[PDB]
Amino acid sequence: RPKYLPGKHPKNQEKTPHVDYNAPLNPKSELFLDDWHIPKFNRFISFTLDVLIDKYKDIFKDFIKLPSRKFHPQYYYKIQQPMSINEIKSRDYEYEDGPSNFLLDVELLTKNCQAYNEYDSLIVKNSMQVVMLIEFEVLKAKNLKRNYLINSEVKAKLLHYLNKLVDATEKKINQALLGASSPKNLDDKVKLSEPFMELVDKDELPEYYEIVHSPMALSIVKQNLEIGQYSKIYDFIIDMLLVFQNAHIFNDPSALIYKDATTLTNYFNYLIQKEFFPELQDLNERGEINLEF
């Protein structure tokens, strides 16, 4: 028998607090910071959601229809904007604020869930994974024009940046992200990557594998790169994001490893946007690398 029971686990709460529709879960996200357009956006949304429902049935199943109002009648006064995948599939997003409204309707799927249910439940962590996997797909579509095939030189650059991440310390990260506003005397010995290198033992911590549906570790990403499992840049990038996001799904917000997964997501993002991609643009123009699709 499994540690985590499935289904809804309503908080025992007379009054339930508002969910802020407008605030992104991640303000630092390029999904919200960047201007982007997917042509035939409505078609893209229905296609992509259907691929995911089929690939990830067990995770997606509770989010397809709105909660049953006969089993969960209190939901419809506790939650101000009930949301489901079928509801999103039935909406129009082909107007100027469409993309943004789409992401916020999607993020509702986890906000509403974390408001109704006990945080430490399978249903809540499933909802986080639903939102995460949807946003991965958008991230790939958004970055179509720079999602180059991993050829020999691109492979080598990605292995370099991956190693730079693995080797990063409190001092090095803060210097990169804050420059001359970095605090002095930060630690330069301990690598933040340490708890992310290897998967936890199935026999030691089985409930990990009830919660984290797509386990991933940095040593596995490295191996994947070396043997050619990633076809394009964003195939690599999403497995990296999966590594850090799974630690946020599994662990408590107040845990060190949760804090370090935030710090490493931020630093990885910095490496991709400010070092890796600009260096590729530069080497391309100088005719020292080929960037293929």
Give the CA dihedral 130, 113, 209, 1, nearest 10 degrees: -130
Q: Does domain 29-142 have CATH number 1.20.920.10?
A: yes
Domain boundaries, the chain: 29-142, 143-287
Specify the CATH superfamily of domain 143-287. Answer: Bromodomain-like (1.20.920.10)
Which neighbouring-strand residues pair with 10? 117
Question: Would you tell me how many other CB atoms lie within 10 Å of the CB of residue 279?
Answer: 14
Helices 218-227 & 152-167 angle (0-180, nearest 10): 160
Measured between alpha carbons, how far is 172 from 189 in angstroms, rounded to an integer?
Answer: 10
Name the nearest CA neighbour of 219 among 164, 166, 156.
166
Under 8 Å between Cβ of 196 and 244: yes
Cβ-proximal residues to 187 (8 Å cutoff; 6+ apart), any chain: 169, 170, 171
**Residue 286 C-beta-side C-alpha neighbours within 13 Å:** 8
Q: Are 149 and 32 in contact (CB under 8 A)?
A: no
Q: What are phi and psi of 160, to 5 degrees?
A: -60, -55
Task: Please name the method used to determine this structure.
Answer: X-ray
Query: Dmax of the chain from CA atoms?
Result: 66
Alpha helices in the chain (DSSP H): 30-33, 41-55, 57-60, 75-78, 85-89, 98-116, 122-142, 152-167, 170-178, 207-211, 218-227, 233-250, 256-270, 277-285
Resolution value in angstroms: 2.2
